[PDB]
Write a protein that binds this ligand. Sequence first.
Ligand SMILES: [Zn+2]
Lengths: 93, 192, 424, 562, 190, 59
Amino acid sequence: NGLDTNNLSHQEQEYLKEYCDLITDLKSGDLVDIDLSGSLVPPSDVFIDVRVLKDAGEIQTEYGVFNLIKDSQFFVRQSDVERLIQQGYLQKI
Amino acid sequence: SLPAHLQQTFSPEEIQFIVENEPIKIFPRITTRQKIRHTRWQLITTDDKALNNMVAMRSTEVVLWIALLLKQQSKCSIVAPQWLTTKELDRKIQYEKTHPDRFSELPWNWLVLARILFNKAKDDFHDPIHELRGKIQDLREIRQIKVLKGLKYLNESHLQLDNLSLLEINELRPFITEIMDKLREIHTASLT
Amino acid sequence: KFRYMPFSPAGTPFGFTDRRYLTMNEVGYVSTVKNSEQYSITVSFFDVGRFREYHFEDLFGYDLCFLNEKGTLFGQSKTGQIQYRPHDSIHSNWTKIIPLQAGERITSVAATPVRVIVGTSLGYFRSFNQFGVPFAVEKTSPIVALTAQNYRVFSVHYSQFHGLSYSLSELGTSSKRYYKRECPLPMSLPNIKDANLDYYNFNPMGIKSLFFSSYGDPCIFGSDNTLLLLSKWRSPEESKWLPILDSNMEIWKMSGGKETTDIHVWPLALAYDTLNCILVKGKHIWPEFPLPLPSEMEIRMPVFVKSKLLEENKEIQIPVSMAAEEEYLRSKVLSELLTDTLENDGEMYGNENEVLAALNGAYDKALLRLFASACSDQNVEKALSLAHELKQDRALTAAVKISERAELPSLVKKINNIREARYE
Amino acid sequence: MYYGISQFSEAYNKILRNSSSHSSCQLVIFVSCLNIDALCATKMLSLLFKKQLVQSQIVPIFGYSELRRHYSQLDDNINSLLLVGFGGVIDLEAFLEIDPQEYVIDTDSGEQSFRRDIYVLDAHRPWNLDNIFGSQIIQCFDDGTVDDTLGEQKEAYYKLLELDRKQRKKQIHEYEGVLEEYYSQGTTVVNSISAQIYSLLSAIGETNLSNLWLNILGTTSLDIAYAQVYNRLYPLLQDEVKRLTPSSSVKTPDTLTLNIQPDYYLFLLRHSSLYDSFYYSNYVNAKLSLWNENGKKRLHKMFARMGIPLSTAQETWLYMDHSIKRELGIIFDKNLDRYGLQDIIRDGFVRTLGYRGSISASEFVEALTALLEVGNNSAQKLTNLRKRWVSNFWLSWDALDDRKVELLNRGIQLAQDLQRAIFNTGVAILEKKLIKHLRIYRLCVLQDGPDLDLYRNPLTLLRLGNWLIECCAESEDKQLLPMVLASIDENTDTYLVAGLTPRYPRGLDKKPILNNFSMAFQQITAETDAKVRIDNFESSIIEIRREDLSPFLEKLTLSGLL
Amino acid sequence: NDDDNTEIIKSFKNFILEFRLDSQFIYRDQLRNNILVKNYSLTVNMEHLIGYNEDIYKKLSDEPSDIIPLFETAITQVAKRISILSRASLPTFQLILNSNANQIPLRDLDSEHVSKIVRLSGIIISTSVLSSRATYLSIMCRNCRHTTSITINNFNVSLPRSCLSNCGPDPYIIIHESSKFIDQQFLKLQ
Amino acid sequence: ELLPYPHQLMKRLLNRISMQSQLIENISMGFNESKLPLLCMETELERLKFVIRSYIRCR
Ligand SMILES: [Zn+2]
């Protein structure tokens, strides 16, 4: 969630919600250049090949506009699509 | 917040990062040198003077992630160290077979650097890769036999090794630390 | 009698293989492959960013090549077929057949920014420009080796009735000055089993390579595996050939004293205090097609005797006395070379003045280490001769302190008299 | 005409001048999926752009409508487009509604520049004259047929466009007759995309063993129906193999070698038994007629004559006794002349590395073709099915890597099973005589059979088609005729119709025959109200309804453009 | 003939020590992980041995009964190289083969396949009791009371007639205290 | 044990990473094409961000 509601209690739901507000408050203000909910793997490969799993439309990135056509290959940086790998819409290496 | 498999130890890719952050001798295949008649490099975690003074077909010293990044470009070829030769590895094998109680005087990053240069520099070795990897595997196996022999001396007080590699520290860290922690817990409960 | 063979710098023979290197230098390497009565020539460059490597299908059978930073000159020895190919592919390639008599072969070729030089086995010396217009037909002693760097041309001549010699010239876009013309060359030709005879049937002169340094000083690598540099070539009354690497001795030195045969040095270039060269392992001197990384060999002045190094070592560890001696001699000759190149041609970068200052520092540090070994044997006169060659006034006080530690007050008085001469 | 071979390098430089930017992605490569040549071509292009760091988006496209959908949703930031394996026949301005007025930037001086470059890597030799000549935006990587053949059409088109009574009619109708003679011409291939991209790599200087092996695979994949192309491109591959080979040795785990050695014209020799390799080969069944029982008797008799026992012949090639397989060339030379199988002797390229076994180019391209084929309200079914073959194409792309040999072995097993199905359906066609003679073309309609759900795939129907053309080509009693091959899909309820060109027997050694089905398909689609699909990149692949099949074939046999 | 035997042992030693597929020595790691769980055995794929050297494949497949003990000796030598430090025990190992060959049926098993490696399939109907075969035998002479050793490999040997010191016609007995034994289970295949 | 915080070191590191962020964005506005120093900046920034992220996440 930083980068299924039946099983939790209402007190656990509000615990999870307020913890989500805390962890989205942590990366604001100070510690803002990094992301605290980011990837814990080191970026030992600056560019990766990325394969699209599911069709997710046209998305934007920092300085360019990406497509999410299903079953397509990108040769892009790990940090540009690292969050999208975490969502699972992109999955390769 | 931290995952359970990264709680009390380093993952091997963090060890890869740590040994990617060292200097290494290298041969540039591009000329970035300003003549008497191009944005500068300008890095903040390493000395950029050796990278600003990058001369083709010379020996320079750059950090290893730059080395691998430029080897991917093939704009610059990584030079193996002195201990990555057949003769020096045979000398290390002879030292391992000579003194059974003591580990050889190998660098701390001898398994991780060897793996990095085997998977990234397949045409940068003066000696053949074949017997180099064979001697690497032989040294790894005899060091495994020596740490298996030394693990019989799991003491409650302390335990010492001389020249164990960082990757072998992550090999043996959770087992040794947990077993000695429980031995110390047993003896401290045994105290009056 | 004697047979001439076509020579290109650091070329390799065919051997039992079907391919060889036409030429190898600091710019790149040109190799040819036998391709069922034709050839395929691949030109690769060590500078990937400046030059892009290429290859082409050669139907004439070129056995000569010269590779510089602005073109590539191929030459067929038996028919006189030469070709010049610019790298940028803006200027067009040109192809020319020169007249060859019966028994005449092109022995060596060279290229210049404004000229193209072809040398034949009967002594002809044909100079074109870069576009194919002929400019000169000279007759000299038979040129068996050519290497040009920028506007400087260096050549080696040999004949039965003239002997071995060299010629150095600077032709330029202007100021046509010839430095030396057919002055004799101090090099030992090889003593004329099949591992050496496969090469000496191909290269009878024993020239492994012929090049210029990074600062423009000529260098030659003969059959005795020594690198000879020509020092003070701009002044013909002070020119001398300095051996700066007896590479068999350093090969024996890194091997721990073992008389080693299976490793050889194949020279490519000389940067300042460093020869870039592939250490070829095996029974063959020449490297093969999977070319390894060229190793670096620091130049050492040949003052190493094997007897003393074997005597003290009962890795060969040099004692500090003769290490100081070789550091002093190497620092002196390199200081002379850097001073001449900085005074005459100027600095091509910004690093030359500071490395000259550090080189004079290493000069004085080696002289003080010789001064210490002189003072340890109560040798006042040798200590005075050693500190008389001390260059800077900074390091003379160190000699005063060593004289104080050795208790030689007359040496203190004479060094202070030297200082008194040095204040004005 | 816009790019001859000597300036392919220049075109690549232009790509860098539009795409060598670290901040944004600006290069999108449209690849025709379901083609081995485009797959190898895009693999070499992806390796080249990975070595120089160009951002890329590789998009596999099946249909023409799929192309129009993908190009319509493209962002305006993209300035470089590469069309691999297609886009050389249709008019891309008339198809992608391209008007140069809204794409032009900085026209000022006779200079014109655009904000998007669309490059075409197409092997289909009918070239659209507007596309190759009158188009600045659409840039073609021509092999060189424009400088030798297409000059009269160049001048006819140029004086057609330049000049917008008896003199005007006399020259304009003559030039339009020349242009309409060049049009309505059949489709043929004389060069591969992999050869052109390897020529570009030779011009740049990024050639190595991997790109050479991919070029070898791309050239070898055209050996089924375009053997003149492979016979033309073979000496260049031989020169490149002998150029980039090392000096020499002992088998060691790291030395990849790629030899020119006898690689016989067999289906999966080194990964199956010798009996199954002769039994499932198209050429062996083409000559000895293995579909009936007499051909199997003759195959067993020649196994008796060759001295190979059937216990040894049915054993796996890797476990085969090498007293059979070492002197198999001598046995082939001595015994195959009496049975007519002299053309089995063929030198090919065999690559091995380490101790994991040797692979030929032919076995590798049949493995890749099998991984394209069976690698893994009706409009939703067609969309899901197109997504399935795009996933199959990316699985076959995954099989091209060196570290994924398990995908290659899965492709080998899939090729064996698919060839078993192709053999069963081929003898099903041949036994009951569904091949009908229609005096201008030969008709074969599959109404029902074993595992008919494999034939909704295009390349599986082309495999069955090449099986039938090889089997009927050696029978000289019936002459050369084009073939219509229709297969029914019950759930979609459509007849997928393939047009197959005949060919001469392989032993003979001229002018290649053309593909005259696209002209008739287009003219019948224009004249009649048949609801048909023309969207396939191979224009001989159409989809008709079941109820409109017989009128389509009657209008086909009435038309004289076959 | 012992030169060829030790050449075979050294060659299969080099096959174990030098085999590497996808940057991995599979057989050295297999032997180490088999020693670490005290499972003194090595499973060898036939495809891997063919891809290493087909000459070794014919040496294995021609007369297997005379060369499989040599391969056992090579495996034990590799194991003593790997898991035993020198100048500072392990019994004999077992070579277990994996083959992907076509399955020879029981009715086609005949006199042609005698002393050849065959792969077959069937149904087990009876497994017998484990019997104790012997490998190391401490053989004692009854008269001169000297003890020799006989090493037994379970392929294709008996008590010899000379005591190797008249001493006696058949002067040997077996000492069962210093003898090493392995298991042998009889099966019936349908 | 939770180690003491190096306040001055981390304040200097955030100031340095901020100055490098404005430097790389200014050079991106400034965008011969030698993109390898920019790539060195880019992987420099993300590897420093990884080290800072992992240290703060562990503590
Ligand atoms: Zn006895």
